[PDB]
Ligand binder design. Structure first.
Ligand code: 23E
Length: 538
């Protein structure tokens, strides 16, 4: 079937949408084999060990982001979080309807996503806007009731150590380094699927449900999962922001609770089956949605090239063709997975420390957009948290934003940021404790950065018109001095985040209060498009 069908009614604002529509619109041809069936049975056997809880209306309401799109039925995210009678009554009727109606397609809104990318006129032109498909607020709360515990627990139970979202950036690095070191002669590659969401078939969605159905579930949760699969997950009609009929979808919706979980399970299933078809030796996989990384035993240069073509042919049959053809790599640092690469630095005692980094162009351009205009989500804050050990996040992002927060006297004001797909409300004064917990004390003492990493950062600053690193060192010293003068958590920000800036670097002992932070919900699962929210506690 066609991934999408269109009426011709425009994807309306809340211009490049038409270019995206052409790429994502195609008929899918899927052919399954015994490798696929074997991997599926193995995945199902692991899913069989899961017991999932039905969330109450209240618990599901508490997970709703405060700025989540309002319902077309006379209530918004604030009403949901406050447990308002109107919101609650509507949620209970949406739920009752899921239990009673097993067939009627549920309506979804289609929107062009507004994302900031860097204006590079050297290697090509402007990329089209991504498309977001999501159901009404009442349906989104019901999804949580039936599937929040499933999407949070099942991927790890099924995929084990291959499930990427259970790891913090440091644990992701440790996984990859250990996998690389475990091989006699390692070879690794990233597999990029062309428009993954559009490659997801109705059968892929039902196979995914077959995995969810292996959980121990309450009868209502079981019915709701069955109804949500047929009425929403498999496809349904598309409505633009103006309320007009845009067409229809027969592929993955990017804005449903099961997007991340479903994409991870589907990518894993297809990739593990393709590994067997290609006869890749001693495979270690790391999957994050449609992002796949494979580390295996090299069979020789020519053999490795042949095995990747074979892997690609199998992924193509399974309806996961490549965007860019995969390339074998013989250094771990050369693999870009989740837009990131492994790099190494030294701690205060000269000991080797592996960390995750990336090209800083997009993070800096988005930070520049956020500094210029008020935004709902602060990507700069997410990049500080995720890339805390990096030269660019420490010297540029921390320095720039802490000088702004000092000037605005907003150090204690909680800000919303995304941690892989979920929304977290974080006070910037909590950054030293968060960083210590996710990356370790060494994140504040790292030095001896690689020449390639230093050069990538420096060239990027030049290209974007950002002052050089020496200017940032000078700015951090003033920022640090002012933070120190304030005491408490503000002084900790100065002492810990800006220890790299000082002439004579300070000792740095663990932050006593860091252990108190409740990071239990943090690196459990991916919730991209899942409409998930949390406020940082203790
Ligand atoms: O020879 C030497 O010794 C070096 C000298 C030198 C060179 C340039 C400056 N620049 C400045 O002082 C000003 N800008 C900045 O001090 C500045 C700060 C952050 C900047 C950013 C980002 C960095 C990441 C957080 C968001 C802000 C960008 N740009 C920035 C400029 C340059 C800019 O204007 N815009 C963009 C656009 C895209 C990406 C980055 C930028 C402020 C007043 C006049 C312009 C200062 C000193």
């Amino acid at each position: 079937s066609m991934s999408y069908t269109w009426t011709g009614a425009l994807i309306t604002p809340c211009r490049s949408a038409s270019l995206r529509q052409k790429k994502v619109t195609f008929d899918r041809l899927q052919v399954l084999d015994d490798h696929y069936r074997d991997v599926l049975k193995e995945m199902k056997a692991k899913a069989s060990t899961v017991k999932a809880k039905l969330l109450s209306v209240e618990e599901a309401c508490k997970l709703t982001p405060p700025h989540s799109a309002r319902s077309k039925f006379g209530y918004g995210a604030k009403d949901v979080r406050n447990l308002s009678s109107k919101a609650v009554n509507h949620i209970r009727s949406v739920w009752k309807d899921l239990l009673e109606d097993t067939e009627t397609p549920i309506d979804t809104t289609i929107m062009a996503k507004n994302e900031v990318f860097c204006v590079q006129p050297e290697k090509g032109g402007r990329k089209p806007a991504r498309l977001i498909v999501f159901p009404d607020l009442g349906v989104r709360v019901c999804e949580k009731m039936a599937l929040y515990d499933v999407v949070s627990t099942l991927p790890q139970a099924v995929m084990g150590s291959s499930y990427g979202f259970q790891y913090s950036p440091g644990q992701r690095v440790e996984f990859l380094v250990n996998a690389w070191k475990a091989k006699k002669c390692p070879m690794g590659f990233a597999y990029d699927t062309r428009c993954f969401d559009s490659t997801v078939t109705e059968n892929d969605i039902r196979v995914e449900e077959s995995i969810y159905q292996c959980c121990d579930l309450a009868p209502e949760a079981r019915q709701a999962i069955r109804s949500l699969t047929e009425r929403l997950y498999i496809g349904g009609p598309l409505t633009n922001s103006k309320g007009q009929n845009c067409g229809y979808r027969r592929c993955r919706a990017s804005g449903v609770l099961t997007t991340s979980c479903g994409n991870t399970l589907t990518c894993y299933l297809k990739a593990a089956a393709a590994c067997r078809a290609a006869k890749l030796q001693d495979c270690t996989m790391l999957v994050c949605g449609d992002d796949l990384v494979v580390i295996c035993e090299s069979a020789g240069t020519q053999e490795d090239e042949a095995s990747l073509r074979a892997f690609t042919e199998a992924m193509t049959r399974y309806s996961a063709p490549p965007g860019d053809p995969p390339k074998p790599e013989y250094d771990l640092e050369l693999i870009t997975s989740c837009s990131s690469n492994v790099s190494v630095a030294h701690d205060a005692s000269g000991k080797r420390v592996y960390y995750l980094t990336r090209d800083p162009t997009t993070p800096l351009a988005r930070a520049a957009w956020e500094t210029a205009r008020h935004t709902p989500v602060n990507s700069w804050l997410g990049n500080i948290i995720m890339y805390a050990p990096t030269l660019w996040a420490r010297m540029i992002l921390m320095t720039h934003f802490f000088s702004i927060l000092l000037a605005q006297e907003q150090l204690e004001k909680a800000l919303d940021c995304q941690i892989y797909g979920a929304c977290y409300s974080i006070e910037p004064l909590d950054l030293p404790q968060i960083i210590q917990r996710l990356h370790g004390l060494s994140a504040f003492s790292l030095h001896s950065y690689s020449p390639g990493e230093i050069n990538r950062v420096a060239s990027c600053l030049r290209k974007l018109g950002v002052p050089p690193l020496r200017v940032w060192r000078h700015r951090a010293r003033s920022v640090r001095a002012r933070l120190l003068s304030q005491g408490g958590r503000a002084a900790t920000c100065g002492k810990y985040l800006f220890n790299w800036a000082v002439r004579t670097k300070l000792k740095l002992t663990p932050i006593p209060a860091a252990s108190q932070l409740d990071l239990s919900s943090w690196f459990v699962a991916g919730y991209s498009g899942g409409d998930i929210y949390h406020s940082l506690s203790r």
